[PDB]
Amino acid sequence: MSSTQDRSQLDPEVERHTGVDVEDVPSAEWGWSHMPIGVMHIGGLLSAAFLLVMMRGNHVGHVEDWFLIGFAAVIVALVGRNWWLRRRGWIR
Amino acid sequence: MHIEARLFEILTAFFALAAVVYAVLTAMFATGGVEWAGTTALVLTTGLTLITGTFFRFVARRLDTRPEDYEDAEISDGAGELGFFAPHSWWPILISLSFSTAAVGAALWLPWLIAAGVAFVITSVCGLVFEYYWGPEKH
Amino acid sequence: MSTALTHGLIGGVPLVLFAVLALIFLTRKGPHPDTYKMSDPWTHAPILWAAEEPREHGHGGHGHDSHGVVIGGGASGKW
Amino acid sequence: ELDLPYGSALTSSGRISAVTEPGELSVHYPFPTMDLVVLDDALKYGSRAAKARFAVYIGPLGADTAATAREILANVPTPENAVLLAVSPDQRAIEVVYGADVKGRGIESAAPLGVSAAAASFKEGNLIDGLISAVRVMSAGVSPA
Amino acid sequence: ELEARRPFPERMGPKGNLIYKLITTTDHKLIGIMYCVVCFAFFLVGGLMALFMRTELAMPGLQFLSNEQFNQLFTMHGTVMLLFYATPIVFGFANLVLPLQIGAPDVAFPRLNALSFWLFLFGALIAIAGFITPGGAADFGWTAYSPLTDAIHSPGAGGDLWIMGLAVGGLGTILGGVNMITTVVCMRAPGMTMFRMPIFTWNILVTSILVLIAFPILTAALFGLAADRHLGAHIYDPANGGVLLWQHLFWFFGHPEVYIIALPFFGIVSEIFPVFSRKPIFGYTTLIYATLAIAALSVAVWAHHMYATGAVLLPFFSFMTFLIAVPTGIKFFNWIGTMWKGQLTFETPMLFSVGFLITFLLGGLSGVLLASPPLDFHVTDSYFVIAHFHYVLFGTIVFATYAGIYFWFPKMTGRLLDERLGKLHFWLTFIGFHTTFLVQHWLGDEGMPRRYADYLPTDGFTTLNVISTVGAFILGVSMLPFVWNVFKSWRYGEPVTVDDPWGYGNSLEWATSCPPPRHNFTELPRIRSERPAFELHYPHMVERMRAEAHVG
Amino acid sequence: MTSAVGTSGTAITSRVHSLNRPNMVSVGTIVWLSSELMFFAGLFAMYFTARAQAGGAWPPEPTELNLALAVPVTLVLIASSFTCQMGVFAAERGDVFGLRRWYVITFLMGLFFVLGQGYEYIHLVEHGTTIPGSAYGSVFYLATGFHGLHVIGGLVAFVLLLARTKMSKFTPAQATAAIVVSYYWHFVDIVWIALFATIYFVR
Amino acid sequence: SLQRSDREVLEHGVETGIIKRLPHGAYVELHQPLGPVDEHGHPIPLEYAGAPLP
Ligand code: HEA
Ligand code: HEA
Ligand SMILES: CCCCCCCC/C=C\CCCCCCCC(=O)OC[C@H](COP(=O)(O)OCCN)OC(=O)CCCCCCCCCCCCCCC
Ligand SMILES: CCCCCCCC/C=C\CCCCCCCC(=O)OC[C@H](COP(=O)(O)OCCN)OC(=O)CCCCCCCCCCCCCCC
């Protein structure tokens, strides 16, 4: 009971018509709520590329290169799964 | 609440019997007399069940038959305002993290980390305990 | 004893058995009904599917009432 | 009044507690789960832009298909802003029904488009793909309120 | 006359609907699901360690594992699979179904049970963190005997991390046991008298009593060991009774620990059998009495693991071991009677239940052979014991846990697991398990004890070790079908829109919507027997339920 | 918002109507105390097995137990137990103030017990006996110091519950919290009675 | 997820102790609405206004 409902009038400014929708992000119109999927996929691929090229260096062991290969592989697998699902329409 | 108490009474009886027989058969017929490890463990698990069963028996004597203890009890008999059941709370995970910090400080002998973990544990237990009592901020 | 032989055994016998059992089981008709052929008559009971897409304002059924179907158009087709 | 033929009992409140034998399923819909999921996507987020509850009725709608389509639309939770596509493959008959809320939003023009897409798909020999195509076409036709 | 339902339910759910709940969730069902998922992840980790050990053991030489690496492997594998997969997943199943089975809205102390889950998870993480240390995890076996565990022997930080991680996990388990005893004692349906609640809740209550009896001893022993390591506290100095002190304390813990690992899944199987047999659990009162006797005797026969120490009252513990073997036989015959003369349908849950019966029977034969000190002397601390306890465990917490998952997955998901995948998974698991662990009886009978990284080519047990490796990799592949089934059936998979996806259910968790409502119930039936849901769904049967009951 | 959806006078009430049904907080704390009894059982087993293995003089020559500082601390712990019980007696009523007074004096006496135990530890270590020093020293220090950690946890519970009583209206839920804290303190003093009898009297 | 927590608080209201309904065994959280209550028990859902919710 000890509270009063708030009325917030904030200036809005893209119009949010395209991108994310309030059903997915309930505060879509209250601030930045959408990162394009393309930038996320490109960043994941670049992270995998960095991990792979990081095998290039002044280290004699190979456990390190194996961990780098595994992490790059899992990153690329996640990116591929997301991209394939979105291409097919989030199926399987 | 007779059955609950009676269960622990039966467990107490068995554990007392086991402790007594182990002590008697280990004080004699053993290479070093009473083991003092199994015997004490049996005695104090008898005490465990004794504490629980004594509390349950006191409660059962003090308590009139609940529907939960009553056969032929209709569901509507148990209807009513059940007590408070702590809703969503993030203090348990913080308590766990603080205890993990203290635990690593114990394992890795880092007295500073042990002290920090103890402080975190106290703070998080305070948060958990006071979560549903912290009055509104008065400004 | 014959490192190559037993390594191949431990690597293959699991895989071979897995493939055999997958053929045995995964190649069996499932409990899901077979797809309804267009030629065959519609035997299933009437189906109505809805989106649950738009917000319903209140959740509680009470106070929703039955104002009207208020039909706003129509269309038809014969395949 | 009668519960399911076996193993379903009316509980204290309105809700019915039903059961099935261990082997069989419950939904029993005669379509692959993948195509049911695709149609669900078409109805759920393939329609959010429409902001009009989209419904599909595969059952048989006999007699005057229009009136029974109206009656079926009455079964939709929000028939006023709702677009229902009811197809009877026994009668080879499609119908589409809307309410007073979806008026002037492009629903009328998308009516023949959705019906034509469904009919083309059905004659090509696939009910579900026709349903999904009609839902997509009508949803894209209806601008949000 | 027809309802507007969706073509297919939500698969994944709207974005960001789970993370904050997992962090903050107080509901017992979601916490039980997290228990199941995390415990299965730890099972995968421990099984990977097992496959490493087995690949090394297929060869007389040290192909890729150093002696201490292999020792850390079996140590952390045993500890992960006992204290970090099984003792948590018993409480995972508890949180999952026990509040439902007694007609309760939630657990007694929901914040306490969430704390128990998190304490467990982070204790497991810190215990596993021994591997990342340069020295590695704990070298000393799961048992962690005294003089080998002091600072002088095994001075590594992995040992200390193991000690404290087991301590934290034990605190979590103690909190869970307190919570479950309080829930069963206090929270219970208006008609659910103590003697008509399901066998699973009886088993969980007795298991929690055993948890409180045992785990505090583990905490005391581990804290004493930590004091010995970090302070030179002479607690377990062999010149004191230190070695036998630790033996007695740790086994007084662990033996009740194996029985808390077993009893909950005995309860799961006791729930499985009646529903797929279409008849009541045979000798319900007999099952509860057998569970009570099992716990009572387990608390006091701890020292049959110390037959070869030459320092225990062997006749006393052998007699108690036989006395506790008898109640397990009573329970086994109750299960068989429950299966007896019913319209048996072998879906994946009861396939796993029957597999439990088959494997656990041989495990118990091995146990009764081991109970005799004269026999244990030869077969002690050997691969015969490995085969014994792997049969009993893998039967009681892998086959039984798989049965429980395949049983309550619909009641916790609203979706049915694929049955054909269940068939494939069960048969792969059965074949692989029997191939990997059957030969180990002969392997350990002929001289080859446990905890050997390698063995001489001139020695025997080489073909049998590679047979065991074929079996272990059969199990490894067998795990893939189940993981795929769960992953593709949580979000996809045959929706179940009604209670009792496994018809002819009972035990009152099938009186509520198949995805149980928050607070588990919108309606409670007339609780009048041990099978409220069976009576509700089949009212006509109620009279029969009372007519033939006494005939036996 | 008109009056309330749940007609409860406090955001938190007793987890059960204790008049007719068991109070889950009390049951849970009793169960947990019974488990901590087994923890102290492990400690006692350590001490006793060490006792069996001494050459007839269980307190080594360097160690000599000081009853002068040992009897007063056990007496003060018994007094703190009694004052905690009167604090409970106040708690069952609406008198949050009496509960606070009794629990404050109980906290002061428990703190005095802790300081006395620390002083006795300082005297003991200064006169030889020490955890790395000897088996008796180590078992004695382990047992008594784990009990001291339990006492310090009880002091933490006392202060936390007094703060909780400050921050909200005294309700049957806070009365239950006070009762369970009293149960814990009674368990602590009982295990101390046992530890003092075994360490100092029985020896 | 925090946004969804706020939205569900607005839709349903704060949470409290549990009650077993009289006729049947229904368990309900006994929420507490923050705004006007509909003719029946459930309240009109409040619209998020960018401020913290209780
Ligand atoms: C779930 C786990 C679990 C379960 C249920 C059991 C159950 C039993 N265990 Fe188990 N045991 C372990 C886990 C388990 N154990 C582990 C993990 C070890 C590790 C040791 C180590 O590494 O240190 C171990 C070790 C272990 C040993 C030590 C061997 C050695 O190290 O030398 C012994 C006996 O010596 C034993 C005996 C028993 C007995 C008699 C039972 C019985 O309770 C159950 C089986 C017996 C039955 C009798 C059931 C069948 C009954 C019938 C068919 C009825 C009719 C038959 C007759 C009347 C004979 N166990
Ligand atoms: C629950 C308990 C449990 C379970 C299930 C198992 C399962 C298995 N155990 Fe067991 N084991 C013990 C408990 C258990 N064990 C104990 C307590 C000891 C004694 C410890 C000691 O003495 O210290 C022991 C000891 C032990 C030894 C003795 C080692 C030695 O002393 O030298 C061996 C040897 O092969 C072994 C093998 C196996 C195998 C092959 C399995 C198989 O059933 C395992 C199946 C494995 C899988 C299904 C993994 C496949 C999964 C993947 C490939 C995916 C991996 C992915 C990720 C990790 C992300 N175990
Ligand atoms: C599932 C896989 C399971 C695989 C399990 C296999 C583990 C076996 C590893 C070690 C066993 C003990 C041996 C210890 C000795 C090391 C072996 C060796 O001797 O090989 C030569 C170099 C040193 O040679 P050098 O003197 O420095 O000079 C050389 C001159 N040019 O080490 C190496 O190659 C290191 C190779 C070791 C294998 C890789 C292990 C890391 C794999 C990580 C996977 C994680 C994936 C992450 C996913 C996100
Ligand atoms: C787990 C803890 C770690 C492992 C378990 C330890 C349990 C111990 C419990 C209580 C004992 C405390 C009493 C302390 C006072 C006893 C007096 C004594 O022991 O003698 C002085 C010696 C020097 O002896 P000296 O070199 O020979 O020099 C002779 C000078 N002439 O100090 C010492 O080592 C004693 C210091 C011990 C400090 C322990 C701190 C405990 C707090 C831990 C917090 C919780 C962690 C959570 C983990 C999950």
Q: Across the C/E interface, how many CB contacts are shorter than 8 Å?
A: 73
| Strand partners of residue G37 | G43
Both tokens of residue E543? 């009279």
Query: Which numeric CATH code is attached to F24-201?
Result: 1.20.120.80
Cβ-in-10-Å burial (0-12, 13-18, 19+) of B72 comes to: exposed
- Dihedral (Cα; F121, F122, F125, F129), 10-degree rounding: -30
Residues B40, E325 contacting (CB under 8 angstroms): no
The residues pairing with D17 across neighbouring beta strands, listed in sequence order, are D9
Q: Domain boundaries in chain D? A: 1-145
Burial degree of F154 (CB within 10 A; 0-12, 13-18, 19+): buried
Tokens of C57: 């304002």
Residue D96 has φ and ψ, to the nearest 5°, of: -135, 135
CB pairs under 8 A between B and E: 180
**Alpha-carbon Rg for chain G in angstroms:** 13
Of E14, E19, E522, the CB nearest to G26: E522
- Give the structural domain span for C11: 1-79
CATH 1.10.3720.10 fits E18-548, yes or no: no
Tell me how crowded residue B64 is: count the other CB atoms within 10 A of its CB: 11
Pair B48, F36: CB distance under 8 Å: no
Burial E22-35 (b: 16+ CB within 10 A, else e): bbbbbbbbbbbbbb
Separation of A67 CA from ligand 3 center, angstroms? 9
Question: What gap in Å lies between CA F142 and CA E527, rounded to an integer?
Answer: 51
Is E151:B126 a contact under the CB 8 Å cutoff? no
Q: Is the minimum CB–CB distance between G44 and chain C shorter than 8 Å?
A: yes
| Separation of alpha carbons E508 and F81, rounded Å | 45
Integer Cα distance of G11 and G44 in angstroms: 7
Under a CB-based contact definition with an 8 Å cutoff, are residues E154 and E68 in contact?
Answer: no
User: Tokens representing E128?
Assistant: 């596993």
Q: Whose CA is closest to atom 44 on ligand 4?
A: B114
Whether E296 and B48 have beta carbons less than 8 Å apart is answered as no
What residue spans define the domains of chain F?
A: 24-201
Nearest neighbour of F167 by CB, restricted to B66, B122, B133 = B133
Parallel/antiparallel/unpaired status of strands D16-17 and D53-57? unpaired
DSSP for chain B, please give it: -HHHHHHHHHHHHHHHHHHHHHHHHHHSSSTTS--SSHHHHHHHHHHHHHHHHHHHHHHHHHSPPPGGG-TT--GGGG-B-------S-SHHHHHHHHHHHHHHHHHTT-HHHHHHHHHHHHHHHHHHHHTTT-PPP--
C-alpha to C-alpha distance for F169 and F186, rounded to whole angstroms: 26
Say whether C52 sits in a helix, a strand or coil: coil
CA dist., res. F119 & res. F70, Å (int): 10
E3 dihedral zone (left: phi>0; alpha: psi -120 to 50; beta): beta
Q: DSSP labels for E27-73? A: -HHHHHHHHHHHHHHHHHHHHHHHHHHHHHHTSSS-SS--HHHHHHH
Give chain D's end-to-end CA distance (angstroms, integer). Answer: 42
Give one word for G6, left, alpha or beta, with left for phi > 0 and alpha for psi -120 to 50: alpha
How many of the other CB atoms lie within 10 Å of CB of G51?
11
* 3-state class (DSSP) for residue C59: coil
> Cβ of C33 and D30 within 8 Å?
yes
Q: In a mutagenesis test of the C interface, which of E54, E425, E428 is the best target, namely the one with the most C β-carbons within 10 Å?
A: E428
| Under 8 Å between Cβ of D42 and D136 | yes
Give the closest residue to B107 by CA, choosing from E161, C43, D2.
E161
What whole-number distance in Å separates Cα of residue E286 and Cα of residue E333?
10
User: What are the b/e assignments for D102-114, b being 16+ CB within 10 Å?
Assistant: beebebbebbebb
Decide if G13 contacts G33 (C-beta within 8 A): yes
Using CB atoms within 10 Å of the CB of residue B54, give its burial: 0 to 12 exposed, 13 to 18 middle, 19+ buried: middle
CA–centroid distance, residue E80 to ligand 1 (Å): 20
Both tokens of residue C40?
């065959």
What residues of chain E, 213 to 252, have a C-beta less than 8 Å from chain F? 213-217, 219-221, 223-224, 227, 231-235, 237, 239-241, 244-245, 248-249
From the CA of A77, the nearest ligand is 3
Residue that has been written with the tokens 């149609």 in this structure? D39
Locate B32 and state its tokens. Answer: 């070093």
Ligand 4 pocket test: pick from B98, B100, B114 the residue with the most ligand atoms within 8 Å of its Cβ.
Answer: B114
C-beta atoms of A5 and G50 within 8 A = no
> In chain A, where are the structural domains located?
1-92
**Touching C: G residues 3-22, CB under 8 Å:** 11-12
All structural domains of chain B with their residue ranges: 1-139
Contact D128, D101 (CB under 8 A): no
d(CA E52, CA E58): 10
Indicate the DSSP class of residue E530.
S
Place of tokens 């996806």: E501
What does the alpha-carbon distance between residue E206 and residue E263 come to, in Å, rounded to a whole number? 8
Asked how this structure was determined, the answer is cryo-EM
Residue E58 and residue E470: Cα distance in Å, rounded?
A: 9
Distance CA A89, CA E327 (A): 56
3-state helix, strand, coil in chain G (%, to 5): 20, 15, 65
- Distances, alpha carbon G46 to alpha carbons E46, G7, G10, G13, in Å: 49, 9, 5, 9
Beta bridge partners of D96: C75, D85
In angstroms, the Cα distances linking D74 to C65, D58, D82, E5 are: 13, 16, 10, 14
- Expressed in Å, this structure's resolution amounts to 3.0
- Residue B94, CA distances (Å) to D121, E122, F137 in order: 57, 11, 36
Supply the DSSP string of A36-86, one letter for each residue: -HHHHHHHHHHHHHHHHHTTSSS---SHHHHHHHHHHHHHHHHHHHHHHHH
